[PDB]
């Protein structure tokens, strides 16, 4: 699908580009990287729920410093369990 794929990949990033300002001719710039590190075979992308866990956790996770878990539930507005299972989940993925 890429011919198809790589041009709605390019489309929607340049969009996000100028929507945060940033000149639409660094899409293709992106599509290259993007392309270049995660290319090489086919990878089965998340569409509803699972995708919106992982989107969760991965903002949660990337705020975590070691010893701010008590910090994360109160920012995200969770419990320390929720916190704690996406803590758990960036150390188990390899
Ligand atoms: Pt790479
Ligand atoms: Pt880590």
Request: aromatic fraction near 8%.
């Amino acid at each position: 699908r890429f011919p198809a794929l790589l041009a709605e990949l390019n489309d929607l990033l340049r969009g996000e580009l100028s929507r945060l300002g940033v000149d639409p001719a660094h899409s293709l710039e992106i599509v290259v990287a993007i392309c270049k590190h995660l290319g090489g075979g086919q990878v089965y992308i998340p569409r509803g729920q699972a995708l919106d866990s992982l989107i969760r956790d991965l903002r949660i996770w990337n705020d975590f410093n070691g010893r701010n878990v008590s910090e994360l539930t109160t920012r995200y507005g969770v419990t320390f369990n929720t916190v704690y299972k996406a803590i758990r989940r960036m150390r188990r993925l390899k």
